[PDB]
Structure formats: C-alpha cells, structure tokens
Design a protein around this ligand. Structure first.
Ligand SMILES: *[C@@H]1O[C@H](CO)[C@@H](O)[C@H](O)[C@H]1NC(C)=O
Ligand SMILES: [Cl-]
Ligand SMILES: [Cl-]
Ligand SMILES: [Cl-]
Ligand SMILES: [Cl-]
Ligand SMILES: [Cl-]
Ligand SMILES: [Cl-]
Ligand SMILES: [Cl-]
Ligand SMILES: [Cl-]
Ligand SMILES: [Cl-]
Ligand SMILES: [Cl-]
Ligand SMILES: [Cl-]
Ligand SMILES: [Cl-]
Ligand SMILES: [Cl-]
Lengths: 243, 212, 214
C-alpha cells in the first residue's frame, strides 16, 4: 500500500499489488477510482475490487487477466446502474432501467468518435446518433441495425451500421423528374457511394475507416473525377453534396 | 492557381508550331485543359480539351485533324501544335481549365502567321492645315509599334488608332492630336515612334507647311 | 452544334444603370449548363457565372444569371465603370462546346457630331512614291459612322481602310480614321480629293475636300 507494485490499467487507472500475499494466501489490491480494494490470486493487475460510495452505492472493478480490459460496474445496495468497459486501445462502451435491461449505451471509438443510443426499449429500438469530428449524424436504432439519416430537399442519405459495425450507405430521392432525380450506387469494396443525375455521375462520397467522409466531383460530363477528395467537416457540406 | 502560356510567336506559312500551357497551384493532371481561339477582332472558338492524367483528347469537329493537342503529365504541361501553319491561323490562343465551363484562363499566346519579314516603319507628318495634326506610321512588320508625343508629355487629345493590315502584308497606323490653333506658331510637336522588333526609333517633328 | 445568339450586339447605358443581356440557344441547353464571361480589351476572358445562375468565386453579386431551356439572361444590377466590356455566353450541355457572339456594353452619352479633318499626302511621302490621304472623324458619339471617298467626284471602292479607337475614358467619345491609298503617279492625275461623312449628329452628310497642290 506504498511493499507493493504499481500497474497501469486501461481507463486511466492504476492498481497496487502486494509483494508478500495476505493472511490467507491471496494478493490484495488497491485502486483509487473513491478507493476500491480487493484480493486476487495473481500478482499482476488482474482481479476483482469492491467498494462502497458515500451514497451507499457499491462499486465493482474487474481487471482482465491479460491487463487489457477494465469493467467498472455500479450497483445499488444489492441491480445495475452503470457498466463502463474501457480497453487498452482507448475504446470504451451503459445505463439500465428498473427491469435490469439496457436503457442507454455509448460506444466511444478509439479515435474519439462516438455512437450514442438513448431511450432503448425492450424490443431493441431507440434514438441513435453518431458524433464525428465537426458534426453529428442522427437517426434511429432497431433490433436489426442502426440507421443515420441526412435529408436535403427530396433526397435522403441513409448510413447503415450493422450489429458488427459494418457501414453501408443508401440514397433515395422522391423527385419525379428524370432530369433532377438523384440515384446512387454503393461499392462496398471501396466503401464508396457514387451519385448519378440525368444518367451522368456527379460525385463520389467515400466513408473512410477513420470515420470520416470525403467528397469528390466528376466533371460536367460525368467522365473523370477531378481534383482530390475533400474531407467533410460540417453537416451543411453533406447537405450541399445532396443538393 | 495559375496557367502559364509560352510567349508570342511570329511564323511563316508552312512552318510547324507547338505552344504550351503549364499549370501550378493545383493538381494539374486531374482537370481537363482546353484551348480557345480568338481571331483578330472576333469572338471565342473552342478547339478541344485533354485530360492530362490519361491524355483523353476530344476535339471540336471544326479543329479535329487540323491541330494536335497533347500533354506531358510529368511536368504539368499541355500542348497545342500545328504541322503546317497558314496565314488564317493568326490569332490569340488561350488555354483554360475546363469543367466543362472555363474557370481558369491563361493570358493567351499571340500567334502571327505571315510571309512578311521584319521591317521598321516609315513615319510621315500629318501637318495642321482647334487644329488637328498627327503622323503616319506606315509599312511595318510585325506588331506592335509604340507612339508618344513630346516624349510622353502630350497625351490629352491624342488618338493612336489600332493598326490596319494592308494587302501588302505590312501594318500601318496613324496617331493624331488636337491642339489650340494659336499654339502652332510657338509649341513644338514631335511624335516618337518605337518599333522594337526592328529596333527602329524615329522622332518626327510635325510643323505647319512652309506655304502657310 | 448548338448555336448561341447574343442580343443586342451593343448596349448603351450610363453608370449606375441596370443591364440585361440576352443569350438564346438553337436547342434546349441540358441541365442549364450555360456560362457567362467578361472580356476587356487586351485581357483574357473571365468566368462570371456557370450553371446559368451560379456565381464564380470572388465575382460580385451585382452579376446574376437566370433562364433555362433556350433563353438565358445576364443581369448587371448596377453598372460600375469597370463593367463596360464585352460579355460572352457558353453552353456545355452538349458537345461541341460553343460560344455566343458577344455583347459589348458601352457608356451612353449625348450625341456628338464628328469634327472632320482631311490630310493630303505629305511632301516627304510623295517622294517615297506613295500617297495616303487621311480623313479624321474626331470625338463623336455614337460609334456608327459612314465615310466615303470621292476623287474628282468619282466614288472610290476597295482602296481605303478604316480604324476606330476604343471609347474614351474621359468623354466617352470615339474617333475614326479613313486612309485612302494610291501611288504618287495616280495622285497627280486627279484634282479634288474629298471624304463624305454621315453620322447621326449631322443634319446631312458633311464633305471635307481639298484641291491637290494647295
Ligand atoms: C491517374 O492515372 C493513374 C495512373 O494511370 C491512376 O492510378 C489514377 O487512378 C488516375 N487518377 C484519376 C483521378 O483518374
Ligand atoms: Cl474485464
Ligand atoms: Cl436498492
Ligand atoms: Cl437532416
Ligand atoms: Cl487539387
Ligand atoms: Cl458537393
Ligand atoms: Cl508521370
Ligand atoms: Cl514544355
Ligand atoms: Cl507638351
Ligand atoms: Cl523584340
Ligand atoms: Cl470593351
Ligand atoms: Cl465534340
Ligand atoms: Cl475636335
Ligand atoms: Cl481640314
């Protein structure tokens, strides 16, 4: 507690591990989060630590056996209230209702972008939004997938995220005019959406692995991509691309 | 963003010619480059376009088979060339980034195709009979000629007319100035003529005739 | 080819006035792919408007375009001194790309009749073997003028050339020269040399003439 070895942990935490083992053979652990203590069988960071908040809530920190995953759970005096799982790569993921079911969930990516679900029901539906660098996409959640939607005029851009995180993008236009109706094709291999108007390609939208969006225009004849892809930094730039 | 075009050309009929257009400040290879002709005193005519990254070349039907458009992508340059020039090719040639509207223009390359050879002008006074006087700058090639009055001190009332191409192939122009009639007896009027291509410089004093 | 007709060939307006320029296509222009350009003497053209109505970067919003199909318009809401120039339209809705013939926007001013001066050949030129007779029309408005040469009352044809200045920046007038050219030997075979000037500012055509040898 001063006879101890310090171990760095995911989630900006540190745990102190005894060198000598306690009265009953196990190593004791001290990690300040409110100070939590516990006893484990290894002399690394792994183990379980308990504690009690000043408001009578009980805290349970579970450090993974390979030191790459902390699980911070907060209970009432018994019933889950919180469950933050932070990882070594800075990635982290909840609030519960009275029935012990998931009520909210925030997925923080390693790069800082977030995916927030609010008002989750028993069937699995709720309100969803993704926080990117510079703008926020909003949509819904279902037990099937996450759909984020951007509207401009009669055009609707839909970004779909499957359960495993696979991104696919759709576009629909309720415009009746063959001269102005936007259609699009999705190339999942290159993760690129090519928009077409009046049987000419107009622009490519690329949804990168860095959770960003780039736009590149074709020439007036729809023949060649021109210039270089420009990164989108504002929500109005997405709507402009959809005009 | 900028397009730099090569300098003015004076050629004889039958000669070949290649002019260039180099872009900077942007990715030159991924925008179409076009060529536009403007004949002396006329409007604009589109000649063709090229996509430098792959040399996709598309001509106006009015110019296909008459000129060749090319690109050297490694040095961000597009070209326009003739195998055998005619006098009818005398024009200003612009290159412009093509979108397919023209959003960035070079300053133009002036191409003069003529059988004439370099010759300095002859300068003749146009004597005053408000009085009008001037001088006649006749039979020179090629353009341009510069005219000033009294070494640049006299500009008010001065009209130096655009040159005219005579049937002989040489150019000619006049420069005139109007002055008070009471000044012809006391003020000196000298027209200064500079023709750099032949390095000819003439200072012509314009006086009332001796019979006055 | 889509032919673009620009009307009128010349607009005469004062500074601060509204300008309306017409561009009409022989066929409907796809997606309103119609551009407008400005060109001043001795300078390259400059893009003002694309897509019929989109203004290019840095162009002042007093320039606006409108129209669709075959009828397009460039409006200059309030003319500045630097807006008097030649304007061209260009369509890129179909190949080949084509330009209109251009409209010149010039400064309107009061009608001014030309002052006509005639210049016989100089004695130094006659020694070189040639004789140029120069007729000067000075500081007139509007630009349209007609000059005809008569030698001993015989109307000339094909032996004169004209040159016109740009509109003057101070008084908005034009000047014109007409040069009748003939050999020294031919000059000595005639007596009366005359240029006849027709212009809106003259009640009837004005003749300036001289007798060879004066
Ligand atoms: C330009 O050419 C290179 C090589 O041929 C090619 O890899 C690249 O994709 C081209 N770029 C565009 C925008 O077509
Ligand atoms: Cl864990
Ligand atoms: Cl409780
Ligand atoms: Cl929206
Ligand atoms: Cl670029
Ligand atoms: Cl866009
Ligand atoms: Cl290369
Ligand atoms: Cl080169
Ligand atoms: Cl002076
Ligand atoms: Cl030189
Ligand atoms: Cl002009
Ligand atoms: Cl074509
Ligand atoms: Cl006068
Ligand atoms: Cl006179």
């Amino acid at each position: 507690l001063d006879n101890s070895v310090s171990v760095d942990l995911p989630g900006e935490m540190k745990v102190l591990v005894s060198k000598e083992k306690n009265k009953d053979g196990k190593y004791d652990l001290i990690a300040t989060v409110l100070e939590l203590k516990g006893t484990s069988d290894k002399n690394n960071g792994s183990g379980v630590l308990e504690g009690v908040k000043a408001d009578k809530s009980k805290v349970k920190l579970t450090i993974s056996d390979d030191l790459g995953q902390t699980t911070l759970e907060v209970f009432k005096e018994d019933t889950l209230v919180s469950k933050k799982v932070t990882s070594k790569d800075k990635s982290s993921t909840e609030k519960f209702n009275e029935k012990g079911e998931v009520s909210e969930k925030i997925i923080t990516r390693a790069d800082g972008t977030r995916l927030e679900y609010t008002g989750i029901k028993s069937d699995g539906s709720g309100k969803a939004k993704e926080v990117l660098k510079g703008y926020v996409l909003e949509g819904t959640l279902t037990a099937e997938k996450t759909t984020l939607v951007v509207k401009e005029g009669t055009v609707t851009l839909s970004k779909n995220i499957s359960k495993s995180g696979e991104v696919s993008v759709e576009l629909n236009d309720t415009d009746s005019s063959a001269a102005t109706k936007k259609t699009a094709a999705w190339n999942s291999g290159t993760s690129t959406l090519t928009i077409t108007v009046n049987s000419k390609k107009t622009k490519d939208l690329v949804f990168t692995k860095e959770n960003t969006i780039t736009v590149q225009q074709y020439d007036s004849n729809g023949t060649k991509l021109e210039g270089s892809a420009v990164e989108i930094t504002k929500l109005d730039e997405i709507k402009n691309a959809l005009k | 963003m900028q397009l730099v075009q090569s300098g003015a050309e004076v050629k004889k009929p039958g000669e070949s010619l290649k002019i260039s257009c180099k872009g900077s400040g942007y990715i030159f290879a991924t925008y179409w480059i076009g060529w536009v002709r403007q004949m002396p005193g006329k409007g604009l005519e589109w000649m063709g376009i090229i996509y430098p990254n792959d040399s996709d070349t598309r001509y106006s039907p009015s110019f296909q088979g008459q000129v060749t458009i090319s690109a050297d992508k490694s040095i961000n340059t597009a070209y326009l060339q003739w195998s055998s020039l005619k006098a009818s090719d005398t024009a200003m040639y612009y290159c412009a980034r093509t979108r397919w509207y023209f959003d960035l223009w070079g300053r133009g390359t002036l191409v003069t195709v003529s059988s004439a050879s370099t010759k300095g002008p002859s300068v003749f006074p146009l004597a005053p009979s408000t009085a009008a006087l001037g001088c006649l700058v006749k039979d020179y090639f090629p353009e341009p000629v510069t005219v000033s009055w009294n070494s640049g001190a006299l500009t008010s009332g001065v009209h130096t007319f655009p040159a005219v191409l005579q049937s002989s192939g040489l150019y000619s122009l006049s420069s005139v100035v109007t002055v008070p009639s009471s000044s012809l007896g006391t003020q000196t009027y000298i027209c200064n003529v500079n023709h750099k291509p032949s390095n000819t410089k003439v200072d012509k004093r314009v006086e009332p005739k001796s019979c006055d | 080819e889509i032919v673009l007709t620009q009307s009128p060939g010349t607009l005469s307006l004062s500074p601060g006035e509204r300008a309306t320029l017409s561009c009409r296509a022989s066929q409907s222009v796809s997606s309103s792919y119609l551009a407008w350009y400005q060109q001043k003497p001795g300078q390259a053209p400059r893009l003002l408007i694309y897509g019929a109505s989109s203004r290019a970067t840095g162009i002042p919003d007093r320039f606006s375009g409108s129209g669709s199909g075959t009828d397009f318009t460039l409006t200059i809401s309030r003319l500045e001194p630097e807006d008097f120039a030649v304007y061209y339209c260009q369509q890129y809705g179909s190949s080949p790309l084509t330009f209109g013939g251009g409209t010149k926007v010039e400064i309107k001013r009061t009608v001014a009749a030309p002052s006509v001066f005639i210049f016989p050949p100089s004695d130094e030129q006659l020694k070189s073997g040639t004789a140029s007779v120069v007729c000067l029309l000075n500081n007139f408005y509007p630009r349209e003028a007609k000059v005809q040469w008569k030698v001993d009352n015989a109307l000339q044809s094909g032996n004169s050339q004209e040159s016109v200045t740009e509109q003057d920046s101070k008084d908005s007038t034009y000047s014109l020269s007409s040069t009748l050219t003939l050999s020294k030997a031919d000059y000595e075979k005639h007596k009366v040399y005359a240029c006849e000037v027709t212009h809106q500012g003259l009640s009837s055509p004005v003749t300036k003439s001289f007798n060879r040898g004066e």
